[PDB]
Amino acid sequence: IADVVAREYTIHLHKRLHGVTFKKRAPRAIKEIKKFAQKAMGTSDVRLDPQLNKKVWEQGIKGVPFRIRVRISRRRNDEEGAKEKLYSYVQAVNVKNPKGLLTSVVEEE
Amino acid sequence: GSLAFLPRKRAARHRGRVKSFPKDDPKKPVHLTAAMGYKAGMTTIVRDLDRPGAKAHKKEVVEAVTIIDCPPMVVVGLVGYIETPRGLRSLTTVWAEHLSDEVKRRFYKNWYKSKKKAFTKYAKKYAENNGASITRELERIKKYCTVVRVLAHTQIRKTPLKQKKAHLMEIQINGGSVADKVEFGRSLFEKPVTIDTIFEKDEMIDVIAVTKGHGFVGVTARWGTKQWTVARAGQMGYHHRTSVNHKIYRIGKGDDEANASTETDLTKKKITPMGGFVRYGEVNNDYVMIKGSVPGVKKRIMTLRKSLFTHTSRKALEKVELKWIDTSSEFGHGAFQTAAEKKQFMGTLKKDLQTS
Amino acid sequence: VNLRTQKRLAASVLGCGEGKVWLDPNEVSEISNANSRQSIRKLVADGLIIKKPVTMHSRS
RNA sequence: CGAAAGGGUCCUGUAAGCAGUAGAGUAGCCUUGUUGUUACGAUCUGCUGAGGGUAAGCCCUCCUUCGCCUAGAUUUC
RNA sequence: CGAGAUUCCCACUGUCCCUAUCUACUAUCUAGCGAAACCACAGCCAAGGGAACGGGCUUGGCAAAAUCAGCGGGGAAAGAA
RNA sequence: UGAGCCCGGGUCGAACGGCCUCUAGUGCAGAUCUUGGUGGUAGUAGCAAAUACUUCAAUGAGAACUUGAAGGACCGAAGUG
RNA sequence: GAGACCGAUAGCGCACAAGUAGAGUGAUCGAAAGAUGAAAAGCACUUUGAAAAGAGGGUUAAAUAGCACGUGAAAUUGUUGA
């Protein structure tokens, strides 16, 4: 309901990247993460953390992990006459194992 | 290839049409000709064969059988045709009252945004003393028509499919006077009709379907090579086919809970394979088990109809004693009929201790 | 801003290649304002331009 | 409806780590060892049909968790 | 591991095919950019049209906007001792 | 009859015509004619190989090929020095 | 000093920053290209646009003369009308 809200998600990059060219898996993973955030928060303005880019390209151009655990935070873009009022920022989060984890909302307090 | 399946074109309709019902005479009893179902998959069986004259006589043979999910169909209409020098002409059709949301979905194309206003005036025609007009239509069918068909639709919401739009078709009524057929259909209004009511076991039928497409394919696979007579490149697959003489081996009741059990295998199990039919799911309804391969992919709409001609073979007069039905996984090299058998064979496990 | 000239001049003043000099991303405005081989020494003393160490070449 | 998760079904073939004197072997202590000790250690065995993958064109979900939704543009006798 | 016992295959060729490696050419749509060859006018058939001549004529088959893709046919040939 | 001649309407701005003779670099559909301009083809053929790019931020009206930082690749002293 | 000559595809190759630009190792070869308006009076100012420019406005007898400029054909093209 709230326009400003942050949640934690698990992305099955295995099913997103099945059959894709090895030499294009990682950029395809970045585009699939952008599409995932766009579908989840309904915002076309998605900004990725450079350390999330690190995590995607951790194992080379064709070693993208099967499941990635991310935090997507929808915030307000003030700017000056911006085309989109809200924007989603996606970060990589540090967990022991990105399996068996449900979708959880993270509280700012 | 054969110049008998040309103009090698994609099927104009996904449902597939009968194109010929068996000829009708009044002396036979009143009955329906065709039915509908959805291809769930196929499995392996063993039949104690009684083919006098065969080398497999009084022996066990392994056969492949196709399984068709057949939820009961609902009668929602009655159409009457007349004979004219130009062919058959649909003189008039009278529907049922209280049509279902699935058949109304069949009528609509964007059902979600629509005001769902189909057949409301027709229901008012029933309720508001225009039943005189409706009876007039029934009597017109009685006194002018020569062949009568019944409008029936399937139950997707029982079929384990993502679809919600049903399938209508006309099943021809045979064996009686036009008055008897009209009364039969009118009484069949708003009632489910079952596949064991239309067909039964041991009976060869004809299957109408649309065979699977493969897109733009060259002559090597389109015809089988090393003017219309010359092999050309184009669409291969997605073709309307009527495949004849397929033996109905079993009709399972869905609520039996022992559909796959035979008088030889005393295992209380159902037709659905261990883990479910691949890409289809579970069969929880009446199902038809027929010999051999059948046109169409899994979850495709299928038309089952009676044979046009009385049979000329001893394969159509034979009883089918089943020995067992395979319920192993189709998702790989499965060797267990039931999860209980798998557990008994493999013992207990670490997750079993952790959960218990 | 374009910092090709700053990159080259910082390499010249630090006595290294263009690949071993690091410009502060947070101070690109001041690095751009600096356009002389004395202002770049000012920045190097201030810490905004750094000579990165050689790549590790473990021999064991 | 979508994303996760759980269970089922398939594929591979027994994870990391720790421990047992089982351990072929590599060396120190003090003096003779008839059963001397202390450390390292291939390989073995146990925890372990475990560990990993599982629809991307597999199967199921009783409130398993989260989210979405009566839109906005054109055209029609 | 055992005097351990028993079974199978070892060829040449100036021959052919397939698999393997290397070399070369191999490519649909979208945004942008962007030629040339060639061009009387045209392009649906069958028979007939004396001069082994038909594409326009006779008389028949017929024949319904605008397109996409594939392509294996036609729109190319003699001159005669 | 014809080659042609005359008038009206519109545009335009500085010279031109009838009649009788004289004179000639005097009349075009062709010359694979000359010069120039313009089409169909056609938004078609096509815009190669050197494995490879990605995230954030900055300037700018506008950023795949402009820059800074971070990654992922490469030349490998007979170098892409 | 003249002409029954030619009049910018004509007349010398050159009416113009023409033996120039350009081509060839070199000997050499060698073009295309004139015209606003009487007078620049060659559009002040306002507005949109990043800008180029556009729209108002203005000069002029004329902008149906805006330095892509006298008149402005055909081939070819766009829009509207049938």
Resolution given for this structure, in angstroms: 2.8
Which tokens is B303 given?
Answer: 């038309």
Which tokens is B128 given?
Answer: 């508001």
Handedness of CA A46, A51, A54, A56 (dihedral sign): negative
> What does DSSP assign to residue A48?
E
Report helix, strand or coil for C20. helix
Say how far A31 CA is from F64 C1', in Å. Answer: 15
Instruction: Provide the annotated binding site of B for Mg(2+).
Output: 330
Report helix, strand or coil for A64. coil
Can you point out the beta strands (E) in chain A? 5-12, 46-48, 67-76, 86-92, 104-105
List strand F contacts in A 27-46 (CB < 7 A).
27, 30, 46
Say how far B126 CA is from D43 C1', in Å. Answer: 89
Strand order in the sheet with A46-48: A46-48, A86-92, A67-76, A5-12, A104-105
Q: Which nucleotides of F are covered by protein (CB under 7 A)?
A: 51-59, 66-73
Elucidated via: cryo-EM
Contact between B198 and B35 (Cβ < 8 Å): yes
Report helix, strand or coil for C50. strand
Residue B202: CB atoms within 10 A of its CB come to 14
The DSSP bridge partners found for residue C2 are none
Tell me the nt nearest to B233, Cα to C1'.
E70
Q: Name the residue among B168, B162, B150 with its Cα closest to residue B15.
A: B168
A61 touches strand D (CB under 7 A): no
Q: How many residues does chain A have?
A: 109
Contact between B252 and B320 (Cβ < 8 Å): no
B314 touches strand D (CB under 7 A): no
Say how far B238 CA is from E75 C1', in Å. Answer: 37
Which tokens is B321 given?
Answer: 């004693």
Say how far B241 CA is from E51 C1', in Å. Answer: 59
Q: Name the residue among B35, B43, B72 with its Cα closest to residue B284.
A: B72
Tell me the nt nearest to B234, Cα to C1'.
E70
- Please, which chains are in contact with C (at least 3 CB pairs closer than 8 A)? none
Integer Cα distance of B37 and B305 in angstroms: 11
Structure-token match 């225009």, residue found: B130
Q: Enumerate residues 6+ apart whose C-beta is below 8 A from A102.
A: none
SS3 assignment for chain B:
CCCCCCCCCCCCCCCCCCCCCCCCCCCCCCEECEEEEEEEEEEEEEEEECCCCCCCCCEEEEEEEEEEECCCEEEEEEEEEEEECCEEEEEEEEECCCCCHHHHHHHCCCCCCCCCCCCHHHHHHHHCCCHHHHHHHHHHHHHHCCEEEEEEECCCCCCCCCCCCCCEEEEEEECCCHHHHHHHHHHHCCCEECHHHHCCCCCEEEEEEEEEEEEEECHHHHCCCCCCCCCCCEEEEEEEEEEEEEEEEEEECCCCCCCCCCCCCCCCCCCCCCCCECCCECCCCCEEEEECCCCCCCCCEEEEEECCCCCCCCCCCCCCCEEEECCCCCCCCCCCCCHHHHHHHHCCCHHHHHHC
Task: Please report how the helices C4-14 and C39-46 are oriented relative to each other, as an axis angle in degrees rounded to 10.
Answer: 70
**Alpha helix (H) ranges present in chain A?**
13-17, 25-41, 50-56
Amino acid sitting at position B103: V
Structure-token match 């049979």, residue found: B311
| Residues after which a C–N gap over 2.5 Å breaks chain B | 226
Contacts within 8 Å (CB) and 24+ apart, B309-315: B309/B22, B311/B204, B311/B245, B313/B245, B314/B51, B314/B52, B315/B51, B315/B204, B315/B247
Q: How many residues does chain C have?
A: 60
Q: Name the residue among B249, B242, B218, B231 with its Cα closest to residue B316.
A: B249
Task: Please report how the helices B131-144 and B120-127 are oriented relative to each other, as an axis angle in degrees rounded to 10.
Answer: 100
Say how far A71 CA is from E74 C1', in Å. Answer: 68
